[PDB]
Scaffold this active site. Structure first.
Site, PDB file in Angstrom:
ATOM      1  N   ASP E  23     -49.813  33.483 -44.736  1.00 12.21           N
ATOM      2  CA  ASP E  23     -49.989  34.808 -44.163  1.00 12.21           C
ATOM      3  C   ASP E  23     -50.925  35.639 -45.026  1.00 12.21           C
ATOM      4  O   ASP E  23     -50.857  35.601 -46.257  1.00 12.21           O
ATOM      5  CB  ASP E  23     -48.639  35.511 -44.032  1.00 12.21           C
ATOM      6  CG  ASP E  23     -48.572  36.419 -42.825  1.00 12.21           C
ATOM      7  OD1 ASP E  23     -47.506  37.022 -42.586  1.00 12.21           O
ATOM      8  OD2 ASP E  23     -49.589  36.527 -42.111  1.00 12.21           O
ATOM      9  N   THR E  56     -53.802  39.537 -39.871  1.00 10.12           N
ATOM     10  CA  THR E  56     -53.882  40.245 -41.145  1.00 10.12           C
ATOM     11  C   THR E  56     -54.822  39.550 -42.110  1.00 10.12           C
ATOM     12  O   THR E  56     -55.179  40.174 -43.027  1.00 10.12           O
ATOM     13  CB  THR E  56     -52.454  40.377 -41.613  1.00 10.12           C
ATOM     14  OG1 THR E  56     -51.999  39.039 -41.695  1.00 10.12           O
ATOM     15  CG2 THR E  56     -51.589  41.191 -40.684  1.00 10.12           C
ATOM     16  N   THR E  57     -55.185  38.293 -41.910  1.00 11.68           N
ATOM     17  CA  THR E  57     -56.211  37.627 -42.700  1.00 11.68           C
ATOM     18  C   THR E  57     -57.540  37.641 -41.960  1.00 11.68           C
ATOM     19  O   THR E  57     -58.530  37.142 -42.500  1.00 11.68           O
ATOM     20  CB  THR E  57     -55.872  36.189 -43.090  1.00 11.68           C
ATOM     21  OG1 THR E  57     -56.935  35.649 -43.883  1.00 11.68           O
ATOM     22  CG2 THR E  57     -55.692  35.332 -41.855  1.00 11.68           C
ATOM     23  N   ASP E 354     -43.984  36.269 -37.228  1.00  8.64           N
ATOM     24  CA  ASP E 354     -45.264  36.437 -36.552  1.00  8.64           C
ATOM     25  C   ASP E 354     -45.167  36.082 -35.075  1.00  8.64           C
ATOM     26  O   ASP E 354     -45.768  36.761 -34.236  1.00  8.64           O
ATOM     27  CB  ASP E 354     -46.335  35.585 -37.230  1.00  8.64           C
ATOM     28  CG  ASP E 354     -46.605  36.017 -38.655  1.00  8.64           C
ATOM     29  OD1 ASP E 354     -46.932  37.203 -38.869  1.00  8.64           O
ATOM     30  OD2 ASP E 354     -46.493  35.170 -39.564  1.00  8.64           O
TER      31      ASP E 354
HETATM   32  N1  LIG Z   1     -56.066  26.093 -31.350  1.00 10.19           N
HETATM   33  C1  LIG Z   1     -57.035  26.924 -31.800  1.00 10.19           C
HETATM   34  N2  LIG Z   1     -58.338  26.683 -31.540  1.00 10.19           N
HETATM   35  C2  LIG Z   1     -59.307  27.502 -31.981  1.00 10.19           C
HETATM   36  N3  LIG Z   1     -59.073  28.609 -32.704  1.00 10.19           N
HETATM   37  C3  LIG Z   1     -57.812  28.972 -33.035  1.00 10.19           C
HETATM   38  C4  LIG Z   1     -56.698  28.127 -32.592  1.00 10.19           C
HETATM   39  N4  LIG Z   1     -55.573  28.703 -33.050  1.00 10.19           N
HETATM   40  C5  LIG Z   1     -55.935  29.820 -33.730  1.00 10.19           C
HETATM   41  N5  LIG Z   1     -57.270  29.978 -33.723  1.00 10.19           N
HETATM   42  C6  LIG Z   1     -58.029  31.080 -34.363  1.00 10.19           C
HETATM   43  O1  LIG Z   1     -57.673  31.247 -35.736  1.00 10.19           O
HETATM   44  C7  LIG Z   1     -57.953  32.600 -36.099  1.00 10.19           C
HETATM   45  C8  LIG Z   1     -57.098  33.066 -37.277  1.00 10.19           C
HETATM   46  O2  LIG Z   1     -55.706  33.004 -36.984  1.00 10.19           O
HETATM   47  P1  LIG Z   1     -54.677  32.548 -38.133  1.00 10.19           P
HETATM   48  O3  LIG Z   1     -55.414  31.543 -38.979  1.00 10.19           O
HETATM   49  O4  LIG Z   1     -53.379  32.169 -37.467  1.00 10.19           O
HETATM   50  O5  LIG Z   1     -54.400  33.854 -39.032  1.00 10.19           O
HETATM   51  P2  LIG Z   1     -54.321  35.331 -38.407  1.00 10.19           P
HETATM   52  O6  LIG Z   1     -53.815  35.104 -37.006  1.00 10.19           O
HETATM   53  O7  LIG Z   1     -53.329  36.027 -39.307  1.00 10.19           O
HETATM   54  O8  LIG Z   1     -55.731  35.855 -38.490  1.00 10.19           O
HETATM   55  C9  LIG Z   1     -57.763  33.419 -34.833  1.00 10.19           C
HETATM   56  O9  LIG Z   1     -58.876  34.299 -34.675  1.00 10.19           O
HETATM   57  C10 LIG Z   1     -57.752  32.415 -33.698  1.00 10.19           C
HETATM   58  O10 LIG Z   1     -58.787  32.716 -32.762  1.00 10.19           O
END
Ligand SMILES: Nc1ncnc2c1ncn2[C@@H]1O[C@H](COP(=O)(O)OP(=O)(O)O)[C@@H](O)[C@H]1O
Ligand SMILES: Nc1ncnc2c1ncn2[C@@H]1O[C@H](COP(=O)(O)OP(=O)(O)O)[C@@H](O)[C@H]1O
Ligand SMILES: Nc1ncnc2c1ncn2[C@@H]1O[C@H](COP(=O)(O)OP(=O)(O)O)[C@@H](O)[C@H]1O
Ligand SMILES: [Mg+2]
Ligand SMILES: [Mg+2]
Ligand SMILES: [Mg+2]
Ligand SMILES: [Mg+2]
Lengths: 50, 528, 479, 201, 488, 66
Positions: E23, E56-57, E354
């Site tokens: 997170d 948040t990241t 989350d």
């Molecule tokens: N299956 C997936 N395919 C492509 N992009 C994804 C997928 N799951 C999440 N993401 C992308 O990862 C990005 C970062 O999300 P995450 O790494 O969970 O941390 P946070 O949600 O706290 O920013 C998001 O902008 C989302 O668009």
């Protein structure tokens, strides 16, 4: 001295946050508090004018 | 030239980037599994732990759970393997040495794969399909029993004689196996392992230990009270006989003469007499209390011929309600709604230099005591610690009665299932799957390495025998050759082997995903 | 040995020297707990068990350099221990408990090694007498040493030690003037004699001048009432238990008690009530209405003795209903001699305890040690392989004690063991080291013997410790 | 939040204070309540710190224990009969009073700061009562909506809908501690400029 | 630490503790910094988690990339206020464009599936991916239960998250009652019941005692005997009042006595001792009962109803837990997390929080957009197309905004193992030529760049805040010119 | 009986031990008597000091006939 940051654009609070010890300069810090007590605006315009 | 011209962190805080963090987490984990490897197998050695600040407490142990709880490590990645080892000891009580070695062999094979320019997320995704194909091939190889009494008893004897092997008790294995299997069958299916009280005391040899038929208590009887009474009727109580019932209110005496104080004092002494007379209406001759008994009611029991035992804690009152069969009683107002205990003979015994109250002849007998005798204090501590591993693993076989052939046969079984899967999946995951199958085959290697045998030749014979049909082949540590596991009698528990794979695959996954170690400023200790 | 606090103790017991030392090696801290075990069951031979354990672990140095695995040595040592028991059992000789000549000879053998070896024509008979007065010789399976109370008193010399067949109290009486009572009726009390106090918080309120005089008057008639109940039963000696929350004896109750010719003895602990009840046969009394003339224990004489200036003491002798308890008074000149004299007597009680548990007597003076070193030598010739070297190592380590007895006495150790072993395979098997004559002779003509349990318990515990040392391979330091 | 999410309410709004067991068992939305502004401790305690009771018999012992439970229940009944639905108090509210108001669909609050009760009075039109012996219709408040919403992981109480309100309240939504302080100081300059501009046009 | 193929960070506490997390809020929280600007970025992420809970990241990456792009503009002689003025105009073009491509499907109880697919993506990043299908059904089923549908809010006090170490990770389940870590008062009480009426009590079982300084005077012997009789009748009067009303189980906040413990056992009436404050009001809501402060108020209409009250037992330890389920319509549910590691439970708790916070947002606002980088590529074209009609020294600031907005696709491609400039260029070329704004980065190697088919769903208000909040922090930094701090 | 800070009994016990040893030899006494004191003034100090100790309560080789 502790580490708390005070970010501001107004003369009155900037001159309150400096540890001014010069007896002559301490008059300019005292008139700023007078301006923010009577009208509340124009604080940094009486410091350049003085 | 330095780590960025600006200063972000404070003074004393450190950061590690990708190329050096993997170096710390991989040398920290291997160091943990190297100290512990020497204590694996039927012929594993033993360690010594000296405390430098705890008044020099010298303890000698073998299991890989008390060693890790005592070694003070400051490596961040070595603290994960010490925590997962404690959970194994608190879950099934056996398999702490095997879960740390396996999770330390997975990491060693994951450092040579990073050097081949393989992304860590490729290894992890390739290992998930290896654990799934490994737990399916272990469930299918389990033997479910429990429909026959003559067969279930023989399965529990083989499990007990297999756990006690690496432990100091292996000298008298024929004697401590019967004490370990009979004490579990006394529980009558209740998983309450606290009901078995292990009493240890100095003097005598390790071969003088036994399991008492009745019960033993390290308490004392009142003055001039009968030492023995045949055909007793025990009453277990928890009531305040201290001084008197304080009767908690905000009350006080406000008389105006000193003769009126003497009358109230005589009123307390007649309050306790009435309470004692209400106890005797039950028709008992053995009163047992969990609190102190003062000098007034001590003589009242001794004038009617009643044994009073005072100061027995909760550990000795809850147990006595399962042995004799009574109930913990109070308020003493209805003698017909209470149930009394029963015995056949109560005497005083002499074990060494101490006296204990003996209970010969019991109704239920759902709890027992084991008397351990030894030469040194470290043997008594190790005998108790080793015996606790035999009781914990036999309490799991009764709830979930299915066993898996051990002694190296189970490790080679799951390793063959991964190999057949790694020859099917294309891509880089075929490389990552072989590392998983390579780490499972070193568990039998360490067992044969401690005995001084030709390990590189025995594993080749086992791998060649497990790919042709012989699914019960395993190591024979008494001679050094290859022997069957269904004949010699090397048997393990299904739950123990299942918790080793799942725990050692999660800890190798959490550690492998780390790419940045951030340390805060340590709290300083005041010197003066 | 001198402690770091400034305490000096002259000792000879092997279990005491190892306790007072402060060793730091972990392999030597396990030798202290070995000698503790022998002191618990056997009670004698604490020095012998350390020599045996310290000589077997040494014989393992050469076997490791020859390429023998330590596991084989552990299993091969158990082979030579199970055989050694069968050589000691047939050597022993059964004994009965109606033969004072055997017990006297066995209570001096573990007495002549201490500083009181000169005073054994007096301590040995009073040690046998103190054990036959506790157990029933018809059915005896164990002896409680808690039934024997040892009292240490400074002044005089050792030969003034005596055996009192009664109760000895270390505290003087409270009443002044009455120190000699004949044909007494002792009575134990557990309640106090003072102003009335209840468990609940109480107070007395005075709101008139006439009530001030009543508090003093009615108080005085309450203590007097309790004293007149004691004299009704015909009591002469009084024993008050210690109480800390309230006063146990006020100055008024003592003033009344002296006027009725009753001895008052205060400050009795709560841990020795049983020993008092077991000696004079006194029912404890915890309430005034239960103070009946049957709750009392009779006696012949109950008077206090006065020493030469070292203090006073209480002796109650001639109990009408004696129990199975006895007490010993130890006399010495220094605080160091008294302690060593006390440990020497406690050793002569553990030897008599060993004889009742296992009625078997075996000749001492180095006779058994050389016998196991001779049967195991020919036993190992029949075996083959690497186990034939470990039994030979067991036999050689058994000659240390026969070597030590001859070295300390100023004899040639090489010639003594050579002569001892040679005479042990051509005839009799009761030949040992004669420290008086100066050579080797039949050891049964010196009237020296020892229980069989001591020689066996000093061997079973020794082999078990070595089998655990060979398991250890690493040492790691923890927090 | 975002800088464009700041709102101005037409009443009062204060943070949710400490609450005891049962606070989640009472309704959080009213249509036309009657605010009861109080200054009393509605909790089981001693009548006076300087007091002492000297009873002689056990029959009078039990009547004393029932006297303290009847003093408290007398105050709560007087509030409930007045038709009030929301109650506020500077002094604490015990858990017994919280469960009394949960079984009658009535909201309770306690440990309100002095600066917030005075802002309610000139928005609803009540008066602070130090005693419950006189709760008439002219000493109660009134509004149009009352609820307890969530803003930024916090619970806030709203008292909007006051046609005779003579006070307001600014809710500032920013993204850091120094973002709100600089916004409050900037708002403090337009307040005094307009205040001075009415006396001198 | 971004996207499904990200990696997490090791954290060591000041004293001795170790935390493993992915997170973004907690990483910047336990990291101790000394730079004042670095403390502003910590608060930027913290203000995002409590408002939404996801992203948040993603804000600190965009804000950091938004400042870097302004470094070249300053070096060319551009006033910082002019940059901070052009940035706000761009953020009004991107937000107004985000509503145009937003799609709202539905939110209710009967068809739940788009809700499942929304929580599947957020859980995709965390360590809980082996069982992330099961942990996406707990999060959705535990929200529509406790959430009102008229006021559109969620009370997180009504959801209890309790984790117990030891066991297996896939053993996590949703309990429709309350699980309290306590056990029965007497060892001989029955462990389970089949039909229990819960008697919630607040008052202890001791004889009454007034709060004022009472003093009871005993001036005779009959006053003393009338006090022993008073005490013993008070105990028996209590058990009669509980048994009369029909209660089956007693729940108490304070402790019992030595005498009041047997009377409960002797009358076949089990009880639980010393339960906490917050747990009591959850049993009242779940079982449907009411809390009584005395015994005199205990009636038959103030009793709860449970279907099964058991005492589960863990392994070779003395840890007993009381469970309560098989109840009617409830507003309180608990989540039981299992796992074989200390750090697994803590990270599992964070990942579940989350997932719950994402569903809570969908109740306020149904409409969603498609992630995987699709929203950023589309938003960066609207800004760049509008910047061609702004000739006032703002096209430079607008073009710099649309260039820092594309760092999100270039962070997913770099982490996946692909070339950033080679994949990002091919996605925009396909999006302009067609009319499909739902094309992103194929991070999981499935073949199709179409995010609608791959079921990647992101909440709209989550994306709005990552742009509106990130822009305003850049305005503070560009406004600050002087620093005055003491020297060390 | 109004002295606050055992039960203060230790403080008064040690003072009178040194005082008695000093007064037995009449050491350094002429410094006080020469300016107007007398011997009896010091006697009343130790006699009174002993009374306060008594109020602070804590709670030979010829014994043959009586
Ligand atoms: N299956 C997936 N395919 C492509 N992009 C994804 C997928 N799951 C999440 N993401 C992308 O990862 C990005 C970062 O999300 P995450 O790494 O969970 O941390 P946070 O949600 O706290 O920013 C998001 O902008 C989302 O668009
Ligand atoms: N639209 C405008 N165009 C040009 N100058 C302006 C405008 N608005 C305000 N100003 C000038 O900016 C100054 C504001 O200074 P300010 O920072 O508010 O000082 P203070 O905080 O002491 O009032 C005023 O003196 C005014 O002359
Ligand atoms: N008699 C035996 N023969 C062959 N293998 C054995 C024997 N006894 C135990 N083992 C093996 O030794 C391994 C380790 O057991 P041990 O070290 O006693 O405890 P842990 O399982 O905690 O390491 C087990 O996997 C078991 O298969
Ligand atoms: Mg201005
Ligand atoms: Mg094991
Ligand atoms: Mg000796
Ligand atoms: Mg996310």
């Amino acid at each position: 001295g502790r580490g708390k940051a005070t970010i501001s654009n107004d003369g009155a609070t900037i001159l309150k946050l400096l540890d001014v010890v010069h007896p002559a300069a301490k008059t300019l810090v005292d008139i700023a508090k007078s301006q923010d007590a009577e009208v509340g605006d124009g604080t940094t315009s009486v410091t350049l004018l003085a | 030239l330095s780590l960025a011209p600006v200063n972000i962190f404070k003074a004393g805080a450190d950061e590690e980037r990708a190329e050096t963090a993997r170096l710390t987490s991989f040398i920290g984990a291997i160091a943990i599994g190297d100290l512990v490897k020497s204590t694996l197998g039927p012929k594993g050695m033993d360690k010594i732990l000296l405390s430098s600040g705890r008044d020099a407490s010298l303890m000698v142990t073998n299991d890989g759970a008390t060693i890790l709880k005592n070694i003070g490590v400051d490596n961040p990645a070595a603290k994960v393997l010490v925590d997962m080892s404690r959970v194994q000891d608190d879950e099934v009580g056996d398999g702490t040495t095997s879960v740390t070695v396996l999770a330390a062999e997975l990491l060693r094979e994951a450092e040579s794969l990073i050097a081949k320019k393989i992304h860590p997320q490729t290894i992890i995704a390739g290992w998930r399909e290896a654990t799934k194909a490994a737990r399916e091939a272990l469930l299918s190889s389990a033997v479910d029993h429990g429909s026959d009494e003559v067969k279930f008893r023989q399965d529990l004897m083989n499990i007990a004689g297999t756990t006690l092997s690496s432990k100091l008790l292996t000298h008298h294995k024929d004697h401590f196996t019967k004490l370990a299997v009979e004490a579990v069958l006394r529980l009558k299916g209740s998983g309450n392992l606290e009901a078995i009280h292990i009493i240890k005391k100095l003097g005598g040899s390790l071969a003088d230990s036994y399991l008492d038929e009745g019960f033993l208590l390290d308490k004392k009887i009142g003055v001039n009270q009968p030492k023995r009474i045949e055909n007793a009727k025990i009453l277990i109580a928890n009531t305040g006989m201290d001084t008197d019932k304080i009767k908690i209110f905000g009350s006080r005496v406000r008389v105006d003469s000193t003769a009126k104080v003497a009358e109230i004092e005589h009123a307390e002494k007649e309050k306790m007499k009435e309470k004692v007379e209400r106890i005797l209406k039950h028709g008992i001759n053995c009163f047992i209390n969990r609190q102190l008994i003062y000098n007034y009611p001590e003589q009242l029991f001794g004038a009617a011929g009643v044994m009073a035992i005072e100061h027995a804690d909760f550990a000795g009152v809850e147990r006595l309600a399962l042995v004799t069969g009574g109930e913990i009683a109070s308020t003493f107002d209805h003698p017909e709604l209470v149930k009394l205990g029963s015995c056949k003979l109560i005497e005083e015994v002499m074990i060494g230099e101490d006296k204990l109250i003996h209970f010969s002849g019991v109704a239920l007998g759902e709890a027992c005591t084991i008397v351990l005798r030894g030469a040194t204090q470290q043997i008594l501590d190790e005998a108790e610690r080793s015996l606790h591993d035999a009781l914990c693993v036999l309490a799991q076989t009764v709830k979930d009665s299915r066993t898996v052939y051990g002694g190296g046969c189970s490790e080679m079984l799951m390793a063959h299932a991964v190999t057949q899967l790694a020859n099917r999946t294309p891509g880089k995951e075929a490389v990552a799957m072989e590392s998983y199958a390579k780490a499972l085959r070193m568990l039998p290697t360490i067992i044969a390495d401690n005995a001084g045998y030709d390990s590189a030749d025995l594993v080749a014979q086992l791998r060649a025998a497990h790919s042709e049909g012989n699914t019960t082949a395993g190591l024979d540590m008494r001679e050094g050759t290859i022997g069957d596991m269904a004949i010699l009698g090397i048997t393990e528990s299904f739950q123990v082997k299942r918790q080793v794979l799942l725990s050692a695959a999660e800890a190798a996954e959490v550690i492998l995903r780390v790419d940045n170690i951030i340390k805060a400023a340590p709290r300083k200790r005041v010197p003066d | 040995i001198q402690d770091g606090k400034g305490d000096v103790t002259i000792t000879n017991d092997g279990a005491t020297i190892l306790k007072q030392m402060q060793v730091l090696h972990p392999a030597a801290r396990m030798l202290v707990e070995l000698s503790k075990a022998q002191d618990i069951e056997a009670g004698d031979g604490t020095t012998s068990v350390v020599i045996i354990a310290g000589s077997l672990l040494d014989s393992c140095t050469k076997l490791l350099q020859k390429g023998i695995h330590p596991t084989i040595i552990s299993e091969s040592f158990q082979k030579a221990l199970e055989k050694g028991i069968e050589i000691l059992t047939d050597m022993s000789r059964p004994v009965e408990l109606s033969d004072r000549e055997t017990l006297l000879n066995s209570a001096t053998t573990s007495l002549n090694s201490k500083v009181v070896s000169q005073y054994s024509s007096l301590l040995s008979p009073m040690s046998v007498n103190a054990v036959m007065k506790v157990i029933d010789p018809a059915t005896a399976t164990s002896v409680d040493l808690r039934d024997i109370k040892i009292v240490k008193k400074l002044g005089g010399t050792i030969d003034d030690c005596e055996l009192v067949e009664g109760l000895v109290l270390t505290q003087k009486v409270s009443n002044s003037g009455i120190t000699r009572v004949e044909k007494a009726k002792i009575g134990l009390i557990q309640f106090c004699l003072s102003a009335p106090k209840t468990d609940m918080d109480n107070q007395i309120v005075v709101s008139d001048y006439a009530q001030m005089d009543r508090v003093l008057r009615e108080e005085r008639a309450y203590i007097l009432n309790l004293v007149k109940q004691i004299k009704k039963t015909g009591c002469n000696v009084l024993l008050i238990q210690k109480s800390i929350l309230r006063d146990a004896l006020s100055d008024l109750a003592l003033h009344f008690l002296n006027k009725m010719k009753i001895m008052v003895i205060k400050d009795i602990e709560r841990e020795d009530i049983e020993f008092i009840c077991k000696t004079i046969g006194t029912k404890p009394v915890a309430h005034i209405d239960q103070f009946t003339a049957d709750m009392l224990g009779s006696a012949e004489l109950a008077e206090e003795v006065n020493l030469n200036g070292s203090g006073k003491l209480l002796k109650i002798t001639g109990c009408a209903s004696p129990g199975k308890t006895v007490t010993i008074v130890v006399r010495g000149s220094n605080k160091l001699v008294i302690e060593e004299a006390e440990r020497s007597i406690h050793d002569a009680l553990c030897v008599i305890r060993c004889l009742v548990k296992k009625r078997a007597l075996i000749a001492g003076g180095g006779a058994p040690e050389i016998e196991l070193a001779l049967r195991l030598t020919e036993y190992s010739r029949t075996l083959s392989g690497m186990e034939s070297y470990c039994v030979r190592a067991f036999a050689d380590a058994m000659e240390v004690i026969p070597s030590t007895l001859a070295e300390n006495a100023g004899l040639n150790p090489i010639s003594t063991v050579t002569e001892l072993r040679n005479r042990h395979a051509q005839g009799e098997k009761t030949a040992g080291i004669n420290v008086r004559k100066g050579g080797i002779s039949n050891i049964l003509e010196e009237l020296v013997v020892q229980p069989l349990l001591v020689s066996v318990s000093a061997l079973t515990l020794a082999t078990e410790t070595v089998r655990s040392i060979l398991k250890i391979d690493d040492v790691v330091n923890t927090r | 939040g975002a800088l464009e999410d700041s709102q101005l309410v037409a009443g009062v709004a204060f943070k949710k204070t400490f609450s005891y067991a049962g606070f989640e068992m009472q309704p959080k939305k009213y249509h036309n309540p009657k605010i009861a502004l109080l200054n009393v401790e509605l909790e089981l305690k001693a009548e006076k710190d300087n007091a002492e009771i000297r009873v002689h018999t056990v029959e009078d012992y039990q009547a004393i224990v029932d006297a303290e439970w009847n003093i408290l229940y007398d105050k709560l009944e007087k509030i409930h009969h007045s038709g009030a639905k929301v109650v506020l108090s500077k002094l604490p509210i015990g858990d017994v009073a919280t469960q009394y108001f949960a079984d009658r669909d009535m909201f309770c609050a306690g440990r309100v700061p002095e600066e917030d009760l005075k802002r309610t009075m000139m928005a609803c039109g009540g008066s602070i009562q130090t005693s419950v012996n006189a709760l008439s219709a002219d000493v109660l408040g009134r509004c149009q909506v009352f609820e307890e919403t969530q803003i930024g992981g916090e619970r806030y109480n709203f008292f909007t809908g006051c046609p005779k309100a003579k006070t307001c309240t600014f809710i500032l939504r920013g993204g850091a501690e120094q973002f709100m302080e600089e916004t409050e100081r900037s708002l403090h300059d337009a307040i005094m400029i307009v205040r001075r501009a009415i006396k001198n046009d | 630490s971004l996207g499904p193929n990200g990696l997490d960070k090791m954290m060591v506490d000041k004293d001795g503790d170790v935390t493993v997390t992915n997170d973004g809020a907690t990483i910047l929280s336990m990291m101790d910094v000394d730079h004042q600007i670095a403390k502003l970025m910590v608060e930027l992420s913290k203000s995002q988690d409590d408002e939404i809970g996801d992203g948040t990241t993603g804000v600190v990456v965009l804000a950091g990339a938004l400042l870097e792009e302004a470094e070249q503009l300053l070096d060319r002689g551009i006033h910082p206020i002019r940059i901070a003025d052009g940035y706000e105009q761009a953020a009004r073009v991107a937000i107004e464009h985000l509503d145009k491509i937003s799609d709202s499907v539905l939110v209710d109880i009967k068809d739940t599936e788009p809700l499942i697919q929304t929580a599947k993506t957020t859980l995709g990043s965390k360590v809980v991916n082996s069982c992330h299908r099961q942990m996406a059904e707990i999060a959705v089923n535990a929200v529509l239960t406790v959430a009102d549908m008229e006021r559109r809010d969620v009370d997180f006090e009504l959801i209890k998250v309790e984790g117990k170490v030891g066991g297996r990770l896939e053993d996590t389940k949703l309990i429709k009652g309350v699980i309290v870590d306590k056990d029965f008062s007497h060892p001989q009480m029955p462990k389970k019941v089949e039909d229990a009426k819960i008697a919630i009590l607040t008052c202890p079982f001791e004889p009454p005692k007034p709060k004022t300084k009472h003093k009871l005077d005993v001036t005779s012997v009959e006053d003393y005997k009338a006090l022993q009789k008073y005490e013993k009748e008070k105990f028996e009067e209590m058990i009669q009042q509980i048994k009369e009303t029909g209660a089956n189980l007693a729940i108490c906040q304070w402790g019992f006595d030595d005498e009041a413990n047997h009377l409960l056992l002797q009358n076949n009436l089990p009880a639980v001792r010393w339960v906490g404050g917050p747990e009591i009001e959850l049993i009242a809501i779940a079982t449907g009962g009411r809390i009584v402060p005395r015994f005199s108020e205990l009636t038959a209409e103030k009793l709860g109803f449970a279907g099964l009250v058991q005492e589960i037992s863990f392994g070779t330890t003395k840890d007993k837990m009381l469970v309560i389920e098989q109840c009617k319509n409830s507003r309180a549910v608990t989540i039981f997390i299992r796992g074989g590691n200390k750090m697994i439970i803590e990270e599992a708790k964070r990942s579940l929080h989350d997932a719950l916070c994402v569903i809570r947002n969908l109740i306020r606002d149904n409409r969603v957009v498609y992630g995987g980088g699709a929203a950023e590529i589309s938003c960066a074209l609207a800004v760049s197309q509008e910047a061609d009609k702004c000739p006032t020294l703002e096209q430079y600031a607008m073009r710099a905004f649309a260039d820092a907005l594309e760092v999100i696709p270039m962070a997913l491609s770099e982490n996946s193992g692909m070339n950033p400039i080679q994949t990002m260029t091919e996605v925009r070329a396909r999006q302009v030529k067609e009319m499909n704004p739902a094309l992103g980065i194929d991070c999981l190697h499935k073949g199709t760049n179409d995010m609608k088919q791959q079921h990647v769903i992101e909440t709209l208000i989550g994306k709005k805040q990552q742009i509106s909040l990130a822009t305003q922090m850049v305005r503070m930094i560009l406004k600050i010119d002087d620093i005055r701090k003491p020297g060390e | 009986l109004h002295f606050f800070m055992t039960a203060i009994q230790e403080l008064f016990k040690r003072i009178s031990e040194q005082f008695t040893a000093m007064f037995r030899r009449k050491a350094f006494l002429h410094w006080y008597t020469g300016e107007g004191m007398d011997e009896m003034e010091f006697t009343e100090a130790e006699s009174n000091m002993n009374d306060l100790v008594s109020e602070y309560q804590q709670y030979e080789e010829a014994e043959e006939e009586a």
